[PDB]
Design a protein around this ligand. Structure first.
Ligand SMILES: O=C(Nc1cccc(Cl)c1)c1ccccn1
Lengths: 150, 52, 93
């Protein structure tokens, strides 16, 4: 909870200094010459704020990785070192794949369709990798092989 | 095309929100939404959320 | 070139699946499987960039760098999972 509050303070600070305007006037993109399709709708969540959040997450990932590789000598009962490092690397790969598609489609159509979709897809993929390849082997051992549960 | 003919003398620039009508003579805004709940480019995140 | 790379990689990881189950005598088997799995993740994440970055403001400055980063990561996973434990063992004695 202290680690959570360390970023909650920054969240509150950014909320205060930069309120969520949520302006519907997202007419920065404007194909006014054909005058057929125009307009956009998006929240005021800033790219800088997303970068800061991802940087904090990556720092936490680095600490997790260094801890995982420090605690590699634990026997197989508590050997949560290789899966944790694997999950850290998989999340790093997911975020490094998210960065180009998110930060490259700036002066292009369907920016809202690209940025939000790729961000939520990357978040869901990281969460799925973590949850599955952290606990699913254990659930498998528990309720598919009722012999190592003692 | 960035301005609409308000009067026959000269064309008039429309506000930052509205876009000129098809047969000129003014401009009316057309609202948009953040994909609503539509199928295009929303099935993948919704699936990775529900199965998760 | 990318397709032939994935073809060689697919045969490699298919041989890695059959490799899984060998005794502890073959030291460089489980690291090989782990490297193949990491490369699987990397190349599966690469494709969304391949078909997502198209038709954008920078169609050239990102296509020539995403593949480069993918190649670098595919080399780095093999390096880290095949020589870092070797270096650590060397440091012991
Ligand atoms: O594209 C990737 N990573 C990246 C992140 C930021 C900038 C640039 Cl040029 C490249 C990437 C990551 C993982 C797998 C495939 N590809």
């Amino acid at each position: 909870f202290s680690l959570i509050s360390l970023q909650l303070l920054g969240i509150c600070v950014w909320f205060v200094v930069d309120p969520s305007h949520s302006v519907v006037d997202f007419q920065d993109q404007r194909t006014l010459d054909p005058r057929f399709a125009r307009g956009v709708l998006k929240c005021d969540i800033s790219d800088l704020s997303l970068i800061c959040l991802l940087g904090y997450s990556m720092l936490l990932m680095v600490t997790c990785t260094v801890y995982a590789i420090k605690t590699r000598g634990v026997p197989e009962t508590f050997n949560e070192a290789k899966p944790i490092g694997f999950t850290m690397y998989t999340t790093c790969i997911v975020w490094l794949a998210f960065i180009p598609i998110f930060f490259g489609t700036s002066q292009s159509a369907d920016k809202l369709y690209i940025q939000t979709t790729t961000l939520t897809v990357s978040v869901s993929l990281s969460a799925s990798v973590s949850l599955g390849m952290l606990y699913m082997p254990k659930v498998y051992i528990i309720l598919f092989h009722p012999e190592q549960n003692v | 095309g960035y301005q609409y003919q308000v009067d026959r003398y000269t064309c008039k620039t429309c506000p930052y929100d509205m876009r000129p009508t098809e047969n000129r003579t003014g401009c009316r805004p057309i609202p948009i939404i953040k994909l609503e709940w539509g199928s295009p480019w929303a099935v993948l995140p919704l699936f990775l959320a529900v199965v998760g």
